[PDB]
RNA sequence: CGCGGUAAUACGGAGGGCGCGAGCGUUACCCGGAUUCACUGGGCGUAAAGGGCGUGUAGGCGGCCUGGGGCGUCCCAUGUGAAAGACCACGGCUCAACCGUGGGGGAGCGUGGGAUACGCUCAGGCUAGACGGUGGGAGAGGGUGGUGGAAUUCCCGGAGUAGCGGUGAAAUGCGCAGAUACCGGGAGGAACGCCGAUGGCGAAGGCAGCCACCUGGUCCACCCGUGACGCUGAGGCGCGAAAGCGUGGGGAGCAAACCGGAUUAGAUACCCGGGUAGUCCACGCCCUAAACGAUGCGCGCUAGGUCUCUGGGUCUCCUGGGGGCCGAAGCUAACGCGUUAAGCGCGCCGCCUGGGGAGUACGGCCGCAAGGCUGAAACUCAAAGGAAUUGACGGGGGCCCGCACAAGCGGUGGAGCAUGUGGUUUAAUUCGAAGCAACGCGAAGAACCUUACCAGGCCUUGACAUGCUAGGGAACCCGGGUGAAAGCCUGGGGUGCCCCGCGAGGGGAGCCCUAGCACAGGUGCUGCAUGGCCGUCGUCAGCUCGUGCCGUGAGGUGUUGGGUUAAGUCCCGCAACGAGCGCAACCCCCGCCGUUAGUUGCCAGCGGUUCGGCCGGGCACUCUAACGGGACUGCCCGCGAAAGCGGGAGGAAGGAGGGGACGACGUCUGGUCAGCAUGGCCCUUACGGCCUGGGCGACACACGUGCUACAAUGCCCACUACAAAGCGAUGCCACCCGGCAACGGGGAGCUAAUCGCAAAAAGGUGGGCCCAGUUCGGAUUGGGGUCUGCAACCCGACCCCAUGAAGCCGGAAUCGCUAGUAAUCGCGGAUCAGCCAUGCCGCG
RNA sequence: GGAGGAAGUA
RNA sequence: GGGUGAUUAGCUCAGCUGGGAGAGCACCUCCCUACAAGGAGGGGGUCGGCGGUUCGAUCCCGUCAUCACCCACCA
């Protein structure tokens, strides 16, 4: 077990943070202490949609939070009720500058968490997952993609062992620094238990 | 075959689906499938199978030509082959089954007639097969008798002393009673060094000194003879390694069994000290085998190349007989065989039919016994077996490398102290961590809480979250008594926001207290049930794919071979050619420079200077932080083809310039339920929760990692310069005074290139100390202080008067380190009310 | 490259 | 009684014809390895007690004590 978080080795270049402000001196943990349950609420509230990221705009007083989503036409409300609901009850731990936004998605299954979340969402249905992997991988590689990779581990089948699964065709260079590859977390609370499902998509390079 | 070890298309039921249907299934039997008794239609190198070999009777089989008889054989006719059976047609039952009428095939035998290619037999001829004659050839083929030398062992004489012998090591053992080693003499046995080999000989078993007598087998040439006399061979008969046996001997060495020594957990063994049988000879037995080339004999045909043994022929040439070695086609499951077959055929012999039982039991023939030959079955298993592939593993080798061995330094192990660890104990000394991967580790916070441990006191819908019922109330501030604290009881206030009503007065959302709940909560258990994260191999250099090729196929090649490098890095070659993950490189810090920009810096040029960068002033320089050029074996002198190497110039640096981060496929069923989430078991009047105190610092011990040293390159005192980085407003602390000192009061500046922490030590000068247990070291301890917080005994510093211990360079061992590294000297940070910070991470 | 003729322990 | 001889660690035992008691096994620990071979430190002794010579005794000398062997003298 090694390979440290790919995004973890990205971040301080190519991918920029996924977040997005200065801070002083004593404020930074008292802005980050509302900044991170902003991302904690949401989590498991917006989930049936699609979240895989989540923008954090700040530089004083006022907050502007942007979303990424792919699945909108849900979290918007029939009209209003929920999207511009959610503002103002976000204010309640937090009296700032409610702002939002909803970035469209024009491929879901090129972003590295939407599968690993497609794939424990069909992990928790019993389901084959050998055979719900393969599936997926080449549905990533058939959405224009060029490389791929899906590690899950955990007791599949329910059998006593705990062998992890393979389901990848191409090129992952995870140790080269201009390839650009997102990197899915997922989790899937089970009748068995807890499982572990990864993923990589290579997309590009420059 | 197997399924069921929680989520069953196999079990029991249903719904449904499949197949048959007045039937459907089970069981039993016959044939098949079973090319698995092989006539069609098999095998015997390694799978079950070649007799241990030879000789040979009956039998089977047989070269060329000519003639006969026609036994087998073939052809035609005739008889038989009954009917019913099978076959074809036509018809009778209302079809069909059933039946009827009729017509052929005909295996087989008898008779007649005919044919003679093949097999048989008779007569005759021929020369390849076979044998013989002449001349020769080689040989560990064999039996008998003798003979030679070296070496072990023993006996005798002389000389000589303190050990010999044996093993990984020692011991049993021998030895002052004269050994081991020596010289002289003598005895007695077995077996033959070099030649000697991979060679020769025989049927096999087997055969190794020399000479001789007898003796077998084979081979070459001579164109002579016999003229198919040939081959195989059931039964039989003979030979038959070693061991064992009987009877007589011989016995130097070795040595089963027996005894002792030692290793061991024990050693009925391997190692050693003795040692009987035996191995040796004559005779007579068992007759067994990895008797193996695991390959029966005989003959013919199927390419070669190549060393050699042995004949012959006017000869690096031809030819005959053998033993080895690669390989044509062919064969095999492959390995492999290959003119000496496991190839293509013929003849004959023995043998085979899953493994275990079993080479057993019975019967029989042998043998003195040990045993041998012949040679099954009941029962049981769903495999046993052979070859080859991948991988793992190895107390198999080879190569490459790494502070792994060596060259050098410094240090642990030697003393005292800090930390952690094992044990020991206390009531608790929470848990985890276990070679390399634990032990200055989770801890980068063990005075209380942290805290998970002990003891006591107390709380139980709570310290928390969601939801419901009821009383009081909103909320929220303040206090007291007691009680160690917590907790318990009580008091003063105060009284909001929404549906009405001004009003006496109904209601509701939130929040709080008291009662019933749903509940949550647990550092409880399982890291062997997990997710995630971490270490090791290991920065090792490997992990694989597409096409092609080799193989029946698994698979191999590619990745292997030589060389080179840090490297699967690269080159040559290669039935391979390319790629993906990995090395590298794209990222960061330093070495160089350009520009941009000037609240640090600057008289580098000037103008005031309390002669300070303090100022005016300026941005080259100092420094700072953004983007960029630059180093690619680029060029040249040579070397090895090749990558690469000795260079050299220019360049700052040259062959990776020097560090960081990055850690593939995978093992360690590795570490972590105690960072967190989570399955399952458990605890829920407590295994939950709060407080005071105590404990992980306890100590006869031992280890891990560090700290000062045990001193003259040394140690004190005074004076005199240089940092790099890092950090800080409710904090950093200048500076002033006070303090003989840690520090106290006042307070400048700084929310930060400015202010500060902050004085850096080794360094330089100058004086002392002149080798001492020291003016080296500070452990322990008495007394005395300031310094933070409710509170400093176990369980803080710093300072003063001292007390001044071992320590004289450290055994077996053992640790890091190949360059600004090692050592030495010092400067910061990170958690925080205080608190585990000499450990860690950074800097010079 | 093939062929012939130096380990302490579950 | 007469004379030969011992005896030292816990043990089987050396010391040399006088000059600081020692090699093995066992015991404690440390090492390399996890065991056990193997090394380095330390402890361990009334040289059987008692004496005499000697500057100085494990050894020179004389009685005891516990043995062992041999030859009797016991009315
Ligand atoms: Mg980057
Ligand atoms: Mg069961
Ligand atoms: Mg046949
Ligand atoms: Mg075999
Ligand atoms: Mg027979
Ligand atoms: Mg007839
Ligand atoms: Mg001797
Ligand atoms: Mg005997
Ligand atoms: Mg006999
Ligand atoms: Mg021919
Ligand atoms: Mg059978
Ligand atoms: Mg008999
Ligand atoms: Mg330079
Ligand atoms: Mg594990
Ligand atoms: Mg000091
Ligand atoms: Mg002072």
Redesign the pocket.
């Known amino acids: ?6 995004i973890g ?1 990205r971040l ?2 190519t991918r920029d943070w996924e977040s997005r402000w200065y801070a ?3 404020q930074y943990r008292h802005l980050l202490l509302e900044d991170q349950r902003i991302r904690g609420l949401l989590e498991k509230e917006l989930y049936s949609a699609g979240l895989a990221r989540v923008d954090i705009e700040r530089a004083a007083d006022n907050v502007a939070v942007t979303v990424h989503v792919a699945k909108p036409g849900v979290v918007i409300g029939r009209g209003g009720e929920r999207i511009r609901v959610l503002r103002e009850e976000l204010a309640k731990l937090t009296g700032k500058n409610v702002a939002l936004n909803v970035q469209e998605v024009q491929n879901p299954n090129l972003s590295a968490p939407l599968v690993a979340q497609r794939v424990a969402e069909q992990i928790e249905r ?1 389901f084959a997952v050998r055979r719900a992997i393969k599936q997926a991988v080449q549905r990533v590689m058939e959405s224009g993609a060029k490389g791929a990779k899906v ?5 599949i ?6 062998r ?1 699964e ?1 389901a990848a065709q ?10 650009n590859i997102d990197y899915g977390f997922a ?1 899937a ?10 993923a990589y998509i290579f997309l590009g390079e420059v």
């Open positions: 077990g090694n390979k440290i978080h790919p080795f301080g270049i002083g001196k004593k019993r590690i899950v581990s955990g007791r089948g329910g059998a006593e062992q705990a992890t393979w191409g090129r992952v260079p995870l140790h080269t620094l201009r390839a989790l609370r089970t009748t068995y238990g807890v499982l572990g499902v990864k």
